[PDB]
Design a protein around this nucleic acid. Structure first.
Ligand SMILES: OC[C@H]1O[C@@](CO)(O[C@H]2O[C@H](CO)[C@@H](O)[C@H](O)[C@H]2O)[C@@H](O)[C@@H]1O
Ligand SMILES: Cc1nc(Cc2cc(F)c(O)c(F)c2)c(O)n1C
Ligand SMILES: [K+]
Ligand SMILES: [Mg+2]
Lengths: 215, 225
RNA sequence: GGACGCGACCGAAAUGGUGAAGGACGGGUCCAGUGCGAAACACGCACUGUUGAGUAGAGUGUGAGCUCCGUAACUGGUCGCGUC
């Protein structure tokens, strides 16, 4: 039977200077053959800890690992700015090797309301048979946000996709795009295009809209 | 000193084959176990294969057993991953990793290459259409105006976006690509700018899609209204 | 009485043959685990383990001991006989 490595929490928000602990629970004995890695977006993983509790050469001592039976923990005693990243445990007691599903460690900061913008499709795109409408939520925190589309007040569903940036290096905010896709024909059947944004930082939900003909 | 460089990645159709290379430097692979590990976009690390020193014994994840072969050529100090009968779900960044010296790093993988993107899809290579996201005639949100570029229907990844040839960096957010139901990628790059200078300032997005020999520069202006 | 000699019986180092014992007679080999050798397996070394392993050996030892049958050095004991 393959060995499971169940990692928790899958995400965590913390302040610089906080002590954090990340746990991986093996489903069978893996002795002490457990390693922990750090991965920043777009980069390769880097080795932090091997054999459960040994600090890899050159890794700062705020990182430590421990083993309690088949449960394993990585502790960062005091987070520094560069420590925000995703962390993975790995058992290499036997083949095949198993990785935990990762823990993303993100930086807490004060609430920030999104600035909201809506963009109608360009004429150039329209003349090709499809309309993309874009709603932008800019520089907000925390990540949790609700964006819904309405066309002539009818709630859209299943025809939009969202994409979100990584936490910004400077202000620790997120930005998010929601893109509504419609045929040219459907798009031209209707007048009022609105996106409605709900977020903790807004006194009340914000609606941004345009009328198809008018700009 | 120690480095690993993977190469050979690219687009292949399902059922197709691809050979990846992992070129070592600053150490000799013959004294080490070498591993391949992959990561599908937005997903976790998945162990793929390894080769043991001295015995040449090889190991494989069930997901790739029988289709993938790992090998090592000491003369080129290079390891290989030969991938046959590729499937859509083999799509991922492929890393090769050195398992470190036992005394110093137990079974930890101490060095990793930068990774090489393998895309398995029936979709054909295609450069993006780039559309303006025009700054609104209206006043403001949050103090400024916002504009950008919609980079739609390209394949495969990646595309790069800059503004004014790298001169404009502040306030730029380029979103991670999203795979559409059409099996083509799409993304937007936006930037916030002063609303009072929209007529007298120039904003141009520079979009580069190497796989299709496509590079586009689109000037983003306030719409005629 | 004692000594020497001869012989017989006993004992006996040594030696050939024999047939039972398995880890509390050992060694070898295998197996497991752990550490090491640039080394997860394969290879080698070290350490640990017989509630890990056949007394039909699965040994380029079935080696030592013993059981049981012979040969037997003798610096041995006893008895008889001859002689002093
Ligand atoms: O080979 C599958 C095996 O890999 C693990 C990690 O050890 O999961 C990885 O691969 C999956 C793709 O099939 C991903 O979904 C997952 O995110 C990634 O970590 C095991 O969980 C899985 O059994
Ligand atoms: C079956 C078999 N066992 C051994 C040795 C052995 C077995 C045990 F059980 C022990 O306790 C011990 F010290 C040694 C062999 O050589 N073979 C072939
Ligand atoms: K024996
Ligand atoms: Mg061995």
């Amino acid at each position: 039977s393959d060995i499971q490595m169940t990692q928790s929490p899958s995400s965590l928000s913390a302040s610089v200077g906080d002590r954090v602990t990340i746990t991986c629970r093996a489903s069978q004995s893996v002795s002490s053959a457990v390693a922990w890695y750090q991965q920043k977006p777009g980069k390769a993983p880097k080795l932090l800890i091997y054999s459960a509790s040994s600090l890899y050469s050159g890794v700062p001592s705020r990182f430590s690992g421990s083993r309690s039976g088949t449960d394993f923990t990585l502790t960062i005693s005091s987070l520094q700015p560069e420590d925000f990243a995703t962390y993975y445990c790995q058992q290499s007691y036997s083949f095949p090797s198993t990785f935990g599903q990762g823990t993303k460690v993100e930086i807490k900061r004060t609430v920030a309301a999104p600035s909201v913008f809506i963009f109608p499709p360009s004429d150039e795109q329209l003349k090709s048979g499809t309309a993309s409408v874009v709603c932008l939520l800019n520089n907000f925190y925390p990540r949790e946000a609700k964006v819904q589309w309405k066309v002539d007040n009818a709630l859209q569903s299943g025809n939009s996709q969202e994409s979100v940036t990584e936490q910004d290096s400077k202000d620790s905010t997120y930005s998010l795009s929601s893109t509504l896709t419609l045929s040219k024909a459907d798009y031209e059947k209707h007048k009022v295009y609105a996106c409605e944004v709900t977020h903790q930082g807004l006194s009340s939900p914000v609606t941004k809209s345009f009328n198809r003909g008018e700009c | 000193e120690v480095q690993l460089v993977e190469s050979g990645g690219g687009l292949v159709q399902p059922g197709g084959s691809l050979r990846l290379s992992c070129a070592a430097s600053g150490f000799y692979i013959s004294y080490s176990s070498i591993h391949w590990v992959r990561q599908a976009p937005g997903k976790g690390l998945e162990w793929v294969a390894s080769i043991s020193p001295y015995s040449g014994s090889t190991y494989y994840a069930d997901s790739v057993k029988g289709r993938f072969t790992i090998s090592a050529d000491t003369s080129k100090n290079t390891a290989y991953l030969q991938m046959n009968s590729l499937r859509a779900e083999d799509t991922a960044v492929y890393y090769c990793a050195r398992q470190g010296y036992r005394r110093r790093s137990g079974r930890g993988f101490d060095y990793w290459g930068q990774g090489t993107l393998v895309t398995v899809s029936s979709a054909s290579t295609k450069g993006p259409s780039v559309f303006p996201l025009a700054p609104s005639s209206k006043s403001t949100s949050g103090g400024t105006a916002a504009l950008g570029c919609l980079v739609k229907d390209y394949f495969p990844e990646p595309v790069t976006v800059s503004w004014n040839s790298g001169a404009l960096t502040s306030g730029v957010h380029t979103f991670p690509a999203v795979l559409q139901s059409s099996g083509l990628y799409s993304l937007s790059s936006v930037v916030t700018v002063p609303s009072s200078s929209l007529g007298t300032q120039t904003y141009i997005c520079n979009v580069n899609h190497k796989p299709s020999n496509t590079k586009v520069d689109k000037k983003v202006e306030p719409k005629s209204c």
